[PDB]
Design an enzyme around this catalytic site. Structure first.
Site, short mmCIF file in Angstrom:
data_model
loop_
_atom_site.label_atom_id
_atom_site.label_comp_id
_atom_site.label_asym_id
_atom_site.label_seq_id
_atom_site.Cartn_x
_atom_site.Cartn_y
_atom_site.Cartn_z
N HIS A 1 0.84 -1.19 0.00
CA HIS A 1 0.00 0.00 0.00
C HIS A 1 0.87 1.25 0.00
CE1 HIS A 1 -3.48 2.57 0.92
NE2 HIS A 1 -2.69 3.18 1.79
N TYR B 1 2.04 5.53 -5.78
CA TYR B 1 0.92 6.16 -5.09
C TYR B 1 1.35 6.83 -3.79
CZ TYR B 1 -2.99 4.75 -8.06
OH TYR B 1 -3.88 4.63 -9.10
N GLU C 1 -5.10 -6.07 -7.61
CA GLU C 1 -5.45 -5.15 -6.54
C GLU C 1 -6.54 -5.77 -5.67
OE1 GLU C 1 -5.58 -0.80 -7.44
OE2 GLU C 1 -5.14 -1.48 -9.47
#
Ligand SMILES: [Ca+2]
Ligand SMILES: [Ca+2]
Ligand SMILES: [Ca+2]
Ligand SMILES: [Ca+2]
Ligand SMILES: [Ca+2]
Ligand SMILES: [Ca+2]
Ligand SMILES: [Ca+2]
Lengths: 528, 527
Positions: free
Chosen positions: B18, B62, B145
């Site tokens: 993550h 991200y 994902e």
């Protein structure tokens, strides 16, 4: 009660006017008859007919050829008179299908083609020999338009009101001057331009620019400020502007130009820079294609001070001197790639092109604004602004009663900008959607300009003003797009938009046109 | 039949990755919990949850901050592991309403929030302690994902995989280098960039440009080719390029640049002129707002020859020399209005800005193309091309089951062009249409870049790539727009379009952005 009695009349020896193109004027003069070639007044069969106007000046603006762009060729206006008595029937702005039903006509035949129905004639004729329908659907003008039955129109006596086809490529000069005559005596914003003779302007500007560039001593000093073909900047173009104003031949304009009374050095210099950048387009040609490029460069009017020049006491001289200076300035600034063209021939073509554009602009500048500036959901880009007239205009009905539809778009510019309206791109489908060119127009300052529409038929069509249109805040325009719908099942429009193309964009030799896009809603309900 | 057995598995000690932004990384490291601020994974309540990926390199992408543009700040990636057994349930790409009914859940409650239903767990869990849903709706990547139930995610053990928040404005240097490591040993087009240390490139290019501009003898000779502040031409800029290349400090690149092995003099010269014109914008500032302008000027990659330089044997030196020359050339060509900025500081800021952009560009250049170039109804403008992925993409359903919608748009350039993808303008309505930023992204050459979406709330919304994206024919991108629709009556969309904004346009001091517009069909039918 679809009939509007307050606008309906019974006239003896009814006379109206019709503007004909160069190719059609001679056949129209010999007699009115349904043409075998063309649209016969409308792509919608219901409204096919002969169209006249009570304004002979508005008819004059429909004599422009749409064969070419800036050709300068015009046809003429015919005065058409009926024998006996005619009923001008005014009706509500409704669809032909509804008009057919409420007037007691057959729904399976064209509406206008039935104006000579025996039963219809008796009920609505008021005893007249025929009935001519006053145009229900609108126009930006305070003029009245009439739609004649094609068989009835054969009874008209035809005379020449004015003609321009014997003037060749100078016909639109006379058309512009003839239309402006509506402003002449027998009105603070309405200017009469009778003191400008376009043949004088062309000949004097050609002589003046020739005398200047034949002064070799003076021209060499002009090479210090700028060398022909080198990259021109606003500073260089402004100094070139003031160096030209120093010549004896510009004495009548120097003071008024330097003070801002007629134009401004900064407006002509900005236009010169934009003209030089526009001619870096590989496809452009300053000598043989001058109109193509100058037509798409913003701010020609302000580069001439035309709105100022037409109010000056020494009008013709001011206009000649302002056009001469702008032509010499552009010829000195235009990019040179390869063998340079003859400077004198280049100045000649630039002066000629400027006059070809100034005539139409002077006509629009002599008229006060008439079109709204308010629009729904305006789109803006590089000075260009386009919006929907009302919410209802942002729609297209491809169902219910099929036929003639309309879309009105407000066209303007940002303050201080003058954007050429080059063309509009619209959606069409060979199965059910047609562009209706003869019935499409643009209204600016009371002048009605016809649209010439062509087909890409990749479901796209382009419509161009048959006369140069430049957009400003002081001269807003309304584009009236006409479409024709026909009967279909499950038809759709994947690109429900209208593109408005303006000035040329140039970024590192790459060329495109300034564009704004408006989106409408497609209504397929066949309920209403 | 919604369950896809071939993609569903039962895993012990299930681990995934993550990526967290600078502002959230520290709170994520101490434990996974539904944040009170933000969208909690999705503006659609049905899909609210914790989102992880099986690709730790994609998770690194991200971590970029969306507070600013080109800030160079990144967060970090956490490695999250469940206790016991987990069932990864793969399902068909259907609406949550259809999934909820077909899986035996209550239709009046969020789908992901029901993943820990006792009945659902027994029927579909395969005996596992929990169920984690594999993301049904797609993405351009070959990664997987996972969407976790927010209360389930509290059981994850959290570890650091990699972090960049201790590098300040250099975090994205390491993020770029860490992501490219997926190409390094342990396909000809996938390039490993391990020979480039971005801190070295910045230090060496700052030293090189300083040594050049401190050479008064050489710098005066450079005033003959071009004088600072004067009108820049393509011819003048090309001679300025070749004059700089003659300096001893550019000897390692002179041969390859003159021949076209690494870039081309005409490519660097065209970009220099365009940079100089772009800085004529009254609102631009070369010293304090350099990134703002350089980000929207086409062809930075070819002005460096970056795709060639990263394949060279002397990679770092070629790249250092390529960036140094473009900075000196741009500083020499940039318009001077009023009091001139210090030339050294301008070269410094130009060099750093070019490196800020080159890192992201080099990462995309190290990857082979992955996105289709064919699209439905492409729109083109000044090299910029955008089209709908398929016919179904040119639609928006605001009726029927409300919730998460998707629109895919193919983004490219014309052959030989490099157009910055600045932002996309989309339609929204506070009553029924929301932009779904967290789930919007752009995929280019296998790299997934997050989108940051903001509100005008005049029925329009703007979404920008959180990292520089430059469009070319060889590097096509796919924009994934995510929307959320909610229950409404008589809601309508007056501007059913998507704007794609590219390079800056300059006309007589007037400035706009190159724009292409796509139109979609709005469907309000309750199917
Ligand atoms: Ca026939
Ligand atoms: Ca005369
Ligand atoms: Ca000629
Ligand atoms: Ca639950
Ligand atoms: Ca995937
Ligand atoms: Ca800095
Ligand atoms: Ca330009």
């Amino acid at each position: 009660d679809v009939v509007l009695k307050d606008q309906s009349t019974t006239v003896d020896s009814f006379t109206s006017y019709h503007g004909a193109k160069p190719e059609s004027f001679n056949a129209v003069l010999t007699g009115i008859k349904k043409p075998e070639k063309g649209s016969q007044g409308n792509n919608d069969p219901d409204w096919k007919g002969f169209y006249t106007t009570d304004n002979k000046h508005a008819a004059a603006g429909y004599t422009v050829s749409d064969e070419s762009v800036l050709s300068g060729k015009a046809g003429g206006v015919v005065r058409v008179t009926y024998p006996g008595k005619t009923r001008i029937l005014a009706v509500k702005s409704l669809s032909a299908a509804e008009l057919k039903g409420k007037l007691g006509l057959d729904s399976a035949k064209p509406l206008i083609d039935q104006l000579n129905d025996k039963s219809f004639l008796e009920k609505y004729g008021d005893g007249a020999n025929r009935v001519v329908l006053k145009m229900p659907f609108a126009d930006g003008t305070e003029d009245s338009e009439f739609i004649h039955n094609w068989k009835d129109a054969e009874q008209l006596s035809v005379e020449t009101e004015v003609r321009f086809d014997n003037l060749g490529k100078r016909g639109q000069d006379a058309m512009n001057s003839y239309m402006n005559m509506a402003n002449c005596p027998s009105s603070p914003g309405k200017i009469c331009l009778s003191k400008i003779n376009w043949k004088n302007v062309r000949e004097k500007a050609d002589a003046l620019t020739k005398k200047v560039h034949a002064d070799k001593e003076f021209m060499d000093k002009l090479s210090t400020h700028h060398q022909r073909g080198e990259a021109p900047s606003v500073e260089k173009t402004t100094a070139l502007h003031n160096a030209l104003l120093e010549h004896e031949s510009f004495s009548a304009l120097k003071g008024a130009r330097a003070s801002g009374k007629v134009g401004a050095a900064a407006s002509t210099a900005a236009w010169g820079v934009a003209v030089a950048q526009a001619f870096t387009d590989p496809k452009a040609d300053a000598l043989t294609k001058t109109a193509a490029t100058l037509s798409v460069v913003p701010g020609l009017g302000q580069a001439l001070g035309i709105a100022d020049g037409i109010k000056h006491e020494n009008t013709e001289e001011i206009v000649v001197q302002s056009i001469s200076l702008a032509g010499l300035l552009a010829a000195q600034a235009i990019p040179v790639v390869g063998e340079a063209v003859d400077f004198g021939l280049l100045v000649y073509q630039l002066v000629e092109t400027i006059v070809d554009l100034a005539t139409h602009l002077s006509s629009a500048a002599a008229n006060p604004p008439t079109e709204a500036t308010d629009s729904v959901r305006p789109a803006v880009s590089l000075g260009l602004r386009a919006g929907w007239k009302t919410e209802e205009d942002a729609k297209l009905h491809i169902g219910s009663p099929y036929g003639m539809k309309f879309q009105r778009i407000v066209l303007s510019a940002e303050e201080g900008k003058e954007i050429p309206f080059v063309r509009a791109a619209v959606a069409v489908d060979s199965k059910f959607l047609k562009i209706n060119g003869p019935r499409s127009f643009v209204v600016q300052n009371g002048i009605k300009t016809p649209m010439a529409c062509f087909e890409t038929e990749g479901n796209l069509a382009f419509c161009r003003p048959s006369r140069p249109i430049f957009l400003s805040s002081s001269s807003p325009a309304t584009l009236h797009l006409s479409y024709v719908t026909n009967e279909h099942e499950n038809g759709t429009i994947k690109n429900p938009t209208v593109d408005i193309l303006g000035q040329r964009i140039v970024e590192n030799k790459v060329i495109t046109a300034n564009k704004v896009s408006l989106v409408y809603k497609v209504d397929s309900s066949n309920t209403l």
